[PDB]
Design an enzyme around this catalytic site. Sequence first.
Site, short mmCIF file in Angstrom:
data_model
loop_
_atom_site.label_atom_id
_atom_site.label_comp_id
_atom_site.label_asym_id
_atom_site.label_seq_id
_atom_site.Cartn_x
_atom_site.Cartn_y
_atom_site.Cartn_z
N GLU A 162 -27.87 0.29 -15.49
CA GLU A 162 -29.17 -0.30 -15.78
C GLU A 162 -30.33 0.53 -15.22
OE1 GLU A 162 -28.74 -4.37 -14.38
OE2 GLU A 162 -27.92 -5.02 -16.30
N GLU A 348 -21.36 -5.86 -18.98
CA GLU A 348 -21.76 -7.11 -18.34
C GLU A 348 -22.19 -8.11 -19.39
OE1 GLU A 348 -23.90 -5.21 -14.27
OE2 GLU A 348 -24.77 -6.97 -15.26
#
Length: 441
Positions: A162, A348
């Site tokens: 991320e 995720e």
Amino acid sequence: LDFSKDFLFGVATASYQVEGAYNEDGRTMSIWDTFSRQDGKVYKSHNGDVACDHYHLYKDDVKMMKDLGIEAYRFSIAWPRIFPAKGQYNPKGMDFYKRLTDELLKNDIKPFATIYHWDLPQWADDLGGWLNREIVEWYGEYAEKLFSELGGYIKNWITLNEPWCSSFLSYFIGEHAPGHKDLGEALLVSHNLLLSHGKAVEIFRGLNLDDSKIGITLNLNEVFPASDSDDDKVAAQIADGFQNRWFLDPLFKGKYPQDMVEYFGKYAKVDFINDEDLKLISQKLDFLGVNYYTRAVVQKGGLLDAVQIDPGNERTEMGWEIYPESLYNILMRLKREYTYDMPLYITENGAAFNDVVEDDGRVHDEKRVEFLKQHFKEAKRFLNDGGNLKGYFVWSLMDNFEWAHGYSKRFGIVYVDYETEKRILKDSALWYKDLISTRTI
Ligand code: NA
Ligand code: NA
Ligand code: NA
């Protein structure tokens, strides 16, 4: 089978969120140890000193995963354990990840290692951190050491988790460590993160490790305009460029998105862009990891000031809309616009709900069961429409330290009673066990 025997059903964690043992076996502070000690930065001054104590309990946690039938485990490696000072390698830190991955392999769980999941060593930040281009070399040395010491254990590598959070959320919005509020700094950080990713890939390809794959993990959403108006269409385009295309385009097109380069350039410097760097950034990858949680509905509001509209549908305890169709839409968008036939993993997906251990000793998290069911059905639909989805990692294996929210947000399929460190399987874990066993949804 809805999911082939080669499809990987996984779970995910991150080092600072679960490990604890923050000052043991030579580990020195990360920017998040420091950030969580600054007043007002983290909910009730929570920190990861102890977290889930996974550093000490890892054998029990691997046995737990085995009993659930988990096929793959995504975790991150703590840079401050491996290099607790500049140029100072710590074998005791490496030894933890060897015994962790040895445990995983002997229990038939495939390791997926995230090299950087936000726990930058404080010594590196004191030298300028991601704002200092020299970090490309520090990160490359760290990554090369992991490849050389762990390459026989780990065959699936993720450079960064991320980078939108490590750049914009950490340097522009200021909610994450180190908590700056400077758009120009966030843009440069985003470039140095991507360049560091590129350096690791270049090192990786030079090592030619047998049957080993490398990728990156991006948090992606889908942006809807609140209305068919031109104002809301421009607002959606900016929000989509800000969250998704600013990272997808340099990685997979070798070019920053020009509308965003021009937009940002009205407000800050964008002079870090050059051809040589974008060649490194855009090196071919083996897979892309997608972190997906929710969509955004936006209307025109100023600098990145789109009003976020609440469409009135069900939400999690984060306030995030539950909108499973965007998982399919984002995977299809990648197939049609960015990644084509390249393998995709969901690295995720999960949800925070208000979990309570009831008098029967159980956690009846029906809302998480239904959340995961709806999103796995969308994964199945992507596969049956020809998408190249190789696995799906639920965030998270266990309740943990949720960054600026501390321990107040619970994402696990396993409940953690922090006073005792007891693990309690939630109903979502039992549901997932059945999904893995039957491969049917
Ligand atoms: Na920790
Ligand atoms: Na603290
Ligand atoms: Na690629």
